[PDB]
Nucleic acid binder design. Structure first.
Ligand SMILES: [Zn+2]
Ligand SMILES: [Zn+2]
Lengths: 304, 98, 69, 64, 115, 44
RNA sequence: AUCGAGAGA
């Protein structure tokens, strides 16, 4: 039979690495239907904050207004999504945005020529002032009560060195972007993960022993750290199959086509969650699991 | 509201029924299907999205008896919640340990 | 025209790497592969975005109607 | 009541050149939520000699 | 997608006849609802968003003693890219009669277009 | 100064019943300038 | 309105 108790007894997690942007962990003895649900929720169901509505006041640059607003929307922000609520779209725009659901950025950059430019120079940072507009220039403007809630944590982009625009003297950009909560199933600019996928643990089943000069080339058909040689007998064996990406280079050789089969461990997933910068990958995974649980609970409490 | 019983495909005794869920997809559909197929009493379970462009999910449950398709759905939802809770707890423990 | 802020296929932010890529090509005698590797672009989907960018905005910028030429 | 075209209504399709009567049939209407393209099953490609590399076809709506 | 049209106001008159229409607004009771797209000189603002039926130009007609506007005649909305004031090459210094208005159309790739 | 010359790029304002030409030079093409007005968009 | 160039299946 199957039960939650049996799943708890047979379930394990092996966290291989954990950084501020990328976490690599394993889910062991879990079903593909659940691993895929976690992956999908991480990709396109975890809320994040990104620019949605842009209020241009002037744009005399080469970049058109729609392209500039889209490029601003694509920037990731270092904002904790829990610090603001969701926007009720039914309300009119006069009071649709409040102090607790919208973060108002601004950009006011005006290019002028630098009279002190060295002769024969071509560098735009010496020829001109504000020749390059960067994401770090997106100045956070606190509104209402959030001047106290965001005092410790300023609203700055995850990458401040993103090249939003370029200018030439006389050209100015003056906008004011509103960034709100949204999910990656609505727009790809909201997905809190760069990529969040998994893979089955590779399996390298050695059928017949390979020894001698043959074992030399068998090791080279894989990444160097996967296949090893036993010290006692000059055999071949699988040291670490996690270090293997399935390129099936062995199957190209008739020497080893009959001496090894390639497969997977169908209930051993190798996750890899890279975050855009708004939140840690471990928190992203936590929120995906909690989103699946709350989705199931809401469906259960819905009256059929 | 969100969960809808398709009365034109439901057995008179309740042993078989078909459900329509709005704003759902493969994510919840496959998880619910897997967690319901573990019920020893269900005879037939499957999920289907009528059209990809629409946000509707269809769940079919056919029990062998002594229960209801609604009861099987409730048990599957509870077991899915328990599975999510146990994986979250194990991940939390591994994060703390490292 | 102007460097894409995010990679199309995956979504990794590559818009903050164009200038550093040009610096790695110019100052150091690094080829494109080594420069892309050092910038942190692992997947070829991310590598193509910076490897094949044309940066036509530099040519677009010389036609400035707000400046005496 | 000049009501809209529901799912129960019937429509007549046609793809020029109409070399035979099979190239103009009466389909059933299914109102989809995305815009600006006529969705056709793959069974009708042989009937209409149609394709999906830029082909277009007309949709006549009978009124009685 | 960039579209350009020549709003040639000097197409009714011919061979030195007096100027019939002047770009701008008159003293008549023209509705103030159409000032959101037109500058004080009867020309559209740069970057403004125009749909079907909204003004593109505004000229006062002396043969009518009433201010008449033109209209964006296209089902697809667009933004004003640039407005060029063209003056006739004749040695005399006439009024403004030819203005070029460019539109910008956002062609986001949708279902149906070819790749 | 609502207009810009198309050859010398000098700001100039035209009154009514005035010559449609630049003042610093003799170019007959005048580009309209972009003022400060709100243009709402969507970061899509 | 007519005649010229081109494009899609
Ligand atoms: Zn990528
Ligand atoms: Zn001039």
């Amino acid at each position: 039979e199957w039960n939650v108790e049996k799943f708890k007894k047979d379930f394990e997690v092996n966290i291989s690495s954990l950084d501020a942007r990328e976490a690599n962990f394993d889910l062991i003895n879990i079903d593909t239907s659940i691993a895929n649900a976690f992956r999908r929720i991480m990709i396109s169901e975890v809320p994040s904050v990104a620019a949605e509505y842009v209020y241009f006041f002037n744009n005399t640059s080469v970049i058109q207004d729609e392209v500039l607003a889209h490029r601003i929307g694509l920037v990731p922000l270092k904002v904790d999504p829990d610090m603001l609520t969701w926007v009720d779209s039914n309300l009119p725009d006069d009071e649709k945005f409040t102090d607790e659901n919208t973060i108002v950025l601004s950009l006011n950059v005006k290019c002028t020529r630098n009279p002190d430019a060295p002769k024969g120079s071509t560098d735009p940072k010496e020829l001109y002032n504000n020749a390059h507009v960067y994401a770090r220039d997106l100045k956070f403007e606190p509104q209402g009560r959030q001047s106290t809630t965001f005092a410790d944590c300023p609203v700055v982009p995850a990458d401040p060195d993103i090249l939003l625009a370029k200018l030439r003297p006389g050209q100015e950009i003056s906008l004011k972007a509103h960034c709100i909560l949204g999910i990656g199933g609505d727009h790809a600019k909201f997905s809190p993960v760069s990529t969040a996928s998994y893979r089955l643990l590779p399996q390298i089943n050695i059928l017949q022993p390979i020894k001698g000069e043959s074992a030399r080339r068998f090791q080279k058909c894989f990444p160097p750290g996967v296949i090893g040689i036993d010290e006692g007998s000059d055999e071949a064996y699988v040291k670490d199959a996690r270090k293997d990406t399935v390129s099936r280079e062995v199957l190209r050789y008739e020497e080893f086509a009959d001496k090894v089969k390639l497969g997977r461990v169908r209930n051993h997933f190798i996750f890899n969650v890279e975050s855009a910068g708004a939140m840690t990958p471990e928190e992203i995974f936590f929120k995906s699991v909690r989103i699946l649980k709350n989705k199931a609970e809401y469906l259960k409490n819905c009256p059929i | 509201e969100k969960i809808k019983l398709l009365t034109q495909a439901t057995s008179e005794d309740g042993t078989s029924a078909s459900f329509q869920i709005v704003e759902e997809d493969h994510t919840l559909g496959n998880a619910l299907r897997y967690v319901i197929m573990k019920n020893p009493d269900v005879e037939f379970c499957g999920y289907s999205i009528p059209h990809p462009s629409e946000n509707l999910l269809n769940i079919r449950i056919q029990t062998y008896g002594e229960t209801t398709a609604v009861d099987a759905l409730q048990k599957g939802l509870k077991d899915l919640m328990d599975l999510c809770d146990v994986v979250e707890s194990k991940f939390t423990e591994k994060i703390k340990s490292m | 025209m102007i460097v894409p802020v995010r990679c199309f296929s995956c979504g990794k932010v590559v818009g903050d790497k164009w200038e550093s890529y040009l610096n790695l090509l110019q100052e150091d005698e690094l080829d494109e592969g080594t420069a892309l590797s050092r910038l942190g672009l692992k997947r070829y989907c991310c590598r193509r975005m910076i490897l094949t960018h044309v940066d036509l905005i530099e040519k677009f910028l010389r036609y400035n109607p707000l400046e005496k030429r | 009541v000049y009501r809209h075209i529901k799912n129960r209504d019937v429509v007549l399709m046609n793809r020029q050149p109409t070399l035979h009567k099979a190239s103009m049939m009466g389909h059933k209407v299914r109102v989809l939520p995305n815009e600006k393209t006529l969705r056709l099953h793959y069974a009708n490609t042989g009937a209409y000699n149609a394709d999906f590399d830029g082909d277009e076809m007309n949709m006549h709506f009978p009124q009685n | 997608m960039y579209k350009t049209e020549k709003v040639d106001l000097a197409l009714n008159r011919n061979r030195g006849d007096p100027i019939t229409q002047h770009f701008g607004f008159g003293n008549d009771e023209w509705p103030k609802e159409w000032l959101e797209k037109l500058d004080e000189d009867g020309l559209p603002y740069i970057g403004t968003y125009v749909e079907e039926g909204d003004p593109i130009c505004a000229y006062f007609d002396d043969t009518l003693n009433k201010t008449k506007i033109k209209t964006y005649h296209s089902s697809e909305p667009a933004y004003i890219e640039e407005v060029n004031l063209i003056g006739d090459e004749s040695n005399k210094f006439q009024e403004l009669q030819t203005v070029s208005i460019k539109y910008r159309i956002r062609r986001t790739p949708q279902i149906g277009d070819k790749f | 100064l609502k207009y810009i010359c198309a050859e010398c790029s000098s700001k100039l304002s035209l009154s009514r019943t005035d010559a449609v030409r630049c003042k610093d030079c003799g170019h007959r093409i005048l580009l309209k300038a972009r003022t400060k007005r709100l243009v709402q968009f969507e970061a899509r």
